Amino acid sequence: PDARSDARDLTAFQKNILTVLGEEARYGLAIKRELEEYYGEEVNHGRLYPNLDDLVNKGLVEKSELDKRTNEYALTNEGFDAVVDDLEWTLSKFVADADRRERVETIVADDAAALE
Amino acid sequence: DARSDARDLTAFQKNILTVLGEEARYGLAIKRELEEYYGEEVNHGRLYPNLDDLVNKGLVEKSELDKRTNEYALTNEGFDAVVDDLEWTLSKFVADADRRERVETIVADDAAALE
DNA sequence: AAGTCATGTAAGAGGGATGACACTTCGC
DNA sequence: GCGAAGTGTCATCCCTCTTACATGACTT
Ligand SMILES: [Mn+2]
Ligand SMILES: [Mn+2]
């Protein structure tokens, strides 16, 4: 399977969900909480749990159980490709100049400093 | 703030801005690259409503190439929206060494395609 | 058992898409 | 003129989010 076919028509909310899981697997309300900080507003859980179940059936996210009241959601290999594919597509269109490039390099470098 | 504008944007609109980040284009030119991204035919009745809706938000400047042609381009505010949801996904992707190595290889293979 | 936590779920509501129909303008 | 390019517009479908209500599970 190729992620492009199933990961280029997702809503911004669904793409932001996969971006979150790209950092590491989280449970339902942990994704809700880190999405809420991006938007600056509340994220109605009635919007989150259905969007994650759609992302699950498409093969982008997997659903495992921590308790049985809690589910830890994590990207499938296809889902990881979905994030990589869209990141390649943005950098393709952002790295249009030598100036644009190193703006990315320092963006990465700064994020490399943030780990320890 | 850039995140304020960036956060409230359809995916179809984030794609329009990423298109204009590469180069300022005219209406249907944007359409054709969005068709090459989606693998779909992009209804122009959907391209122009949003395009003008991004001009209402201040992220796109609608100039005029010819009396029948418009040239769309990103504003400074428009470009800062693209930068900061680039920064957002890169902060979440760069989670370890191999994710950093992977990114900089993309930018390397990307920067080599500019000749 | 009490108070949460975590998730499931549907009706109505809300907002963009579809698929046309229209105008002007350019090139031959 | 004639065809096409480029864009403007909307009725309606379409689909998602909102906004609640709902349950079982973990902690004490
Ligand atoms: Mn909630
Ligand atoms: Mn069209």
Element (H, E) at B64: strand B60-66
Taking CB atoms and an 8 Å limit, are A112 and B94 in contact across chains? yes
Amino acid at B60: V
* Residue appearing with tokens 């498409």: A58
Taking CB atoms and an 8 Å limit, are A107 and B88 in contact across chains? no
- 3-class secondary structure, B73: strand
Write down the H helix ranges in A1-97: 3-7, 12-23, 28-39, 45-57, 77-94
CA dihedral A56, B3, B85, B59 (to 10 degrees): 110
Backbone φ and ψ for A63, nearest 5 degrees, come out as -120, 115
Residues that constitute the known binding site of B: 37, 50, 104
| B25-26: strand order across its sheet | B25-26, B69-74, B60-66
Name the nearest CA neighbour of B89 among B34, B14, B13, B35: B14
Q: Per the structure block, which two tokens stand in for B41?
A: 């035919």
Report the chain A residue with the minimal C-alpha distance to residue B15.
Answer: A90
Instruction: List the shell of residues around ion ligand 1, using CB closer than 5 Å.
Output: A 45
Taking CB atoms and an 8 Å limit, are B100 and A108 in contact across chains? yes
Method by which the coordinates were obtained: X-ray
| Ligand 1 geometric centre to CA of A10 (Å) | 22
Give distance CA B2 / C1' C23 (Å).
37
Supply the DSSP string of A47-64, one letter for each residue: HHHHHHHHHHHTTSEEEE
Bridge partners of A75, per DSSP, are: A61
Domain ranges of chain B: 1-115
In strand C, the nucleotides that come within 7 Å of a protein beta carbon are 5-10, 16-21, 24-26
The shortest C-alpha distance from B91 to chain A (Å) reads 6
- A-chain CB neighbours of B3 within 8 Å are 38, 40
DSSP A3: H
Name the residue among A87, A94, A114 with its Cβ closest to that of B21: A94
Quick check: B45 CB within 7 A of strand D?
yes
CA gyration radius for chain B? 16
Q: Which of B20, B84, B85, B110 should be substituted to probe chain A, the one whose Cβ sees the most A Cβ atoms within 10 Å?
A: B110
Taking CB atoms and an 8 Å limit, are A104 and B90 in contact across chains? yes
Long-range contacts of B76-81 (CB under 8 A, 24+ apart): B77/B2, B77/B5, B78/B17, B78/B20, B78/B54, B79/B21, B80/B2, B81/B2, B81/B5, B81/B6, B81/B9, B81/B17
